[model samples]
Target: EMATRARAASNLLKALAHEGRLMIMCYLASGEKSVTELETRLSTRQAAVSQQLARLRLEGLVQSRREGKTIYYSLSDPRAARVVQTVYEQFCSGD
Candidate 1:
């Protein structure tokens, strides 16, 4: 009986609450990237990055496209990207 109007908003917060997932979205702020590009820049492993990407996809925060044998991902929502920037600044400001 708790289908409140804020439920989807709460779910958005939940989706954005992961360290790895947040990092991935922030990197994508520069532009789209191949998984390998993300892997190298973040210095994280393939499977770990892929897992986060999958979650981001599920949350509609990112979109994927395939070419040849590789796939690329890019931000799907401008509002989320802006929110990501706010989170990045807050986390790094240290003030």
Candidate 2:
């Protein structure tokens, strides 16, 4: 049991190891956002944002919903959400 969870935890950490992916998870934890919104929020190029979103989706950290021509992504795992929330409170919460 411990071994399985340990490996999963390690994989989760590895998935969030990138700055772009971590930031994407942070916002998605709050609410689902489309690639356009994510790019604007992160203030970067579409390719970069798409790349991170691809990685997160590939790693099962996030899932997407298709609407017309756009896809909105959201946190798919509760574990990932909790970790992002805890980290936000620990380092990002403001008075």
Candidate 3:
């Protein structure tokens, strides 16, 4: 039953399956960031970065706060931290 729930929950995660979107999530895992910061760090175009962020926001994977003209985004759910950590351990960590 747990596996089924996890599987069902994964459907929501599919929205983040794109390479750029995943990268954006990875970047935000550490902390909140403005769209301009993401574009600079990812070396992506402003529109492309914003598009991915919009998708992430729509999926409930991320949340945004407007600080004046700048909008800073962060993970909306703690589940994202678990997912990101697992991926890092499996793919990025040698241990």
Candidate 4:
């Protein structure tokens, strides 16, 4: 049982392995955000944001729904958000 759980946990970490993906998850920890909104917060380009978002979506870390032309994304897994939050507080924070 522990072995099974460990593998799943590893998969979650693998999905969060990238710096960009990690930041995206941290933002989603607050609430759902649109594609434009995320790009603005990250001060990144649409090209890069969409590509990273694709990876997150494929790995099931985040989900999206469209409202007309706008697409909104948010964390799909509570565990992923928790992992991001813990990492943020422990390592990425200033204080």
Q: TM-score for every candidate vs. truth?
A: 0.78, 0.90, 0.81, 0.86
Highest lDDT against the true fold, candidate: 2
Model 2: per-residue Cα lDDT over 9-91, one tens digit each: 99999998888889999889788998778878897577888788889989888999999999899899999899988876776
Deviation of model 2 at 89, angstroms: 2.0
Report the error of model 1 at residue 80, Å: 1.0
lDDT value for model 1: 0.82
Q: Rank the candidates by TM-score, best first.
A: 2, 4, 3, 1
Ranking by lDDT: 2, 4, 1, 3
Residue-level lDDT of model 4, residues 19-85, one tens digit each, is 8878888889888999888988996677878899999999888999999999999999888888888
Residue pairs in clash, model 4:
none
- Per-residue lDDT of model 1, residues 20-82, tens digit only: 887898888778999878888886677888888988899888998999988788999777888
Worst 10 residues of 1 by lDDT: 1-10
Least accurate stretch of 10 residues (summed lDDT) in model 2? 86-95
- Show model 3 residue runs off by greater than 4 Å: 1-4
Predicted candidate 3, C-alpha RMSD: 2.2
What is each predicted model's overall lDDT from 0 to 1? 0.82, 0.87, 0.81, 0.87
Best by TM-score: 2
Residue 83 accuracy (lDDT) in model 3: 90
Alpha carbon deviation, residue 48, candidate 4 (Å): 2.5
